[PDB]
């Protein structure tokens, strides 16, 4: 009769409860088996442990409930965060190792909706830098997906208010850019709806959204936290994004893209202190050091994802 | 955008997950995987307003008092194919009224698997009779497989919560 279980969340706040057949010794691989996912759907995702200010992808052999238990110690090892305020949860998210070439052929509706939800989450949080036109296109697709077909009666005027805009553009653009995009967004939204060449099947629209995200530099990135000193060495807290394309630094406060480097165009070195790593950018003779107690994790991921590339 | 806490209740195998997944994700769940406890979120438009539905998909094989405390609307699901699942719903209805301490609870009786006419055990008039017994409760026969009256389950609960 009795059994143990854990909630595995997704970025929309939904969750699935999974049986823990080996209690807190149950592994990530065992939990993934315990989901409602095909061997089709499973290979694209894995378990992450996430609190408000640190999200980490777990290995298949990790025991996630023990990482939850040990979160204060993990935070102390990897960060300088307030442990009390960080309560971690387990999430099903995109595997950072998933090659873009593999993702581009995905047809499975469930896999698509899971990737879509996660991409939308990143977009609205400001982690996707892109030109105004791309963001407008993404916003138009979100209107079609969330609201269905454009109807002049419902949408032409007094629809795209500041509350509504919050659900379709990055939070970083809401105040100064987005209010000037409404007519452009509405135009593309209307065009989607009235274009019979555009499939209105939900998974088709979600895949179109993903197709527009795939060329964004930070797409599919794992993010780490750190600091750089301006080259009077004023501190700039940063997000370090690592994905199958390369390395990306965002200003933590503004989410502004500070630099984006593709694999094969830069080198890295773990600092001998282990509190930082150095990056050397090519056809540039330019260098910088990122300070972070996640330096070891960053360099190991860079090695892995660079190693994957043919 | 108002939030609506909906709860899908009923015995094992009646199609609670299949209905919820069809509604939320537009996918028909073919394989039977007994639920422990799943929650879904879905924005929809009902009566000219955007509504955020939080749908609790519960275990039928067997936390219940808490589900009823927190829930604003309840879909009580049986399979027209299985008498016992229909019989099991009386006690759930009574439990909800006890926990809420009122008859005035948003609710809908759902006879699922109506695409399986060849296997029907519970007649539609028996379902209708039970709904009337329940203070003229809302009633639908649905199919998660054929997409018959799936959205209507959840929209009706939202309308009931709004009155
Ligand atoms: N033909 C048909 N089959 C259905 C329908 N709804 C569900 N099923 C099937 O019946 C089985 C059980 O469905 P499921 O949604 O898992 O039932 P449940 O009520 O969630 N079970 P539990 O309480 O154990 O989580 C599945 O094989 C599913 O495909 C329907 O409307 N028509
Ligand atoms: Mg179920």
Curated annotation (Swiss-Prot), chain A:
Keyword Nucleus tagged: no
Q: Which GO terms describe its cellular component?
A: cell-cell junction; cytoplasm; cytoskeleton; extracellular space; plasma membrane; protein-containing complex
Expression tissues: Low levels in brain. Very weak expression found in heart and muscle.
Q: What is the effect of changing residue 36 to E?
A: 40-fold-reduced affinity for Rap1A
Q: For this UniProt entry, what is the primary localization, expressed as one broad class? A: cytoplasm
Region span, Interaction with RAP1B: 14-36
Q: Which UniProt keywords apply?
A: Angiogenesis, ANK repeat, Cell junction, Cell membrane, Cytoplasm, Cytoskeleton, Disease variant, Membrane, Repeat
GO annotation, biological process: angiogenesis; cell redox homeostasis; endothelium development; integrin activation; negative regulation of angiogenesis; negative regulation of endothelial cell apoptotic process; negative regulation of endothelial cell migration; negative regulation of endothelial cell proliferation
Q: What is the effect of changing residue 301 to A?
A: Strongly reduced affinity for HEG1
Report the GO molecular function annotations: GTPase regulator activity; microtubule binding; phosphatidylinositol-4,5-bisphosphate binding
Q: What is the effect of changing residue 16 to E?
A: Impairs interaction with RAP1B
Domain FERM residue range list: 4-310
Q: Does the keyword Membrane apply?
A: yes
Localization recorded for this chain is: Cytoplasm, Cytoskeleton; Cell membrane; Cell junction
* Purpose: Component of the CCM signaling pathway which is a crucial regulator of heart and vessel formation and integrity. Negative regulator of angiogenesis. Inhibits endothelial proliferation, apoptosis, migration, lumen formation and sprouting angiogenesis in primary endothelial cells. Promotes AKT phosphorylation in a NOTCH-dependent and independent manner, and inhibits ERK1/2 phosphorylation indirectly through activation of the DELTA-NOTCH cascade.
- Which disease appears in this protein's record? Cerebral cavernous malformations 1: A form of cerebral cavernous malformations, a congenital vascular anomaly of the central nervous system that can result in hemorrhagic stroke, seizures, recurrent headaches, and focal neurologic deficits. The lesions are characterized by grossly enlarged blood vessels consisting of a single layer of endothelium and without any intervening neural tissue, ranging in diameter from a few millimeters to several centimeters. CCM1 inheritance is autosomal dominant.
Description of how the protein assembles with itself and partners: Interacts with CDH5. Found in a complex, at least composed of ITGB1BP1, KRIT1 and RAP1A. Interacts (via C-terminus FERM domain) with RAP1A (active GTP-bound form preferentially); the interaction does not induce the opening conformation of KRIT1. Interacts (via FERM domain) with RAP1B. Interacts (via N-terminus NPXY motif) with ITGB1BP1; the interaction induces the opening conformation of KRIT1 and competes with ITGB1 for ITGB1BP1 interaction. Interacts with HEG1 and CCM2; greatly facilitates CCM2-binding to HEG1.
Q: What is the recorded name of this protein?
A: Krev interaction trapped protein 1
Q: Which organism is it from?
A: Homo sapiens
Mind giving the lineage of the organism this protein is from?
Eukaryota, Metazoa, Chordata, Craniata, Vertebrata
Q: Which gene encodes it?
A: KRIT1
Q: Which residues of the full protein are shown?
A: 417 to 730 of 736
Swiss-Prot record, chain B:
Query: Which keywords does the record carry?
Result: ADP-ribosylation, Cell junction, Cell membrane, Cytoplasm, Disease variant, GTP-binding, Hydrolase, Lipoprotein, Membrane, Methylation, Nucleotide-binding, Phosphoprotein, Prenylation
Q: What is the effect of changing residue 25 to A?
A: Impairs interaction with KRIT1
Q: Name one GO biological process term.
A: Rap protein signal transduction
**Compartment(s):** Cell membrane; Cytoplasm, Cytosol; Cell junction
Q: Where is this motif: Effector region?
A: 32-40
Outcome of substituting residue 59 to G? In THC11; likely pathogenic
Q: Which InterPro entries match?
A: P-loop_NTPase, Rap1, Small_GTP-bd, Small_GTPase, Small_GTPase_Ras-type
Q: Where are the transmembrane segments?
A: none
How is this protein's activity kept under control?
Activated by binding to the GTPase-activating protein RAP1GAP. Activated by guanine nucleotide-exchange factor (GEF) EPAC2 in a cAMP-dependent manner.
Disease field reads: Thrombocytopenia 11 with multiple congenital anomalies and dysmorphic facies: A form of thrombocytopenia, a hematologic disorder defined by a decrease in the number of platelets in circulating blood, resulting in the potential for increased bleeding and decreased ability for clotting. THC11 is an autosomal dominant, syndromic form. Affected individuals have chronic and persistent thrombocytopenia, dysmorphic facial features, and multiple congenital anomalies with involvement of the cardiovascular, genitourinary, neurologic and skeletal systems.
Relate the assembly described in the record.
Heterodimer with RAP1GAP. Interacts with EPAC2. Interacts with SGSM1. Interacts with SGSM2. Interacts with SGSM3. Interacts with KRIT1. Interacts with RAP1GDS1.
Protein name (record): Ras-related protein Rap-1b
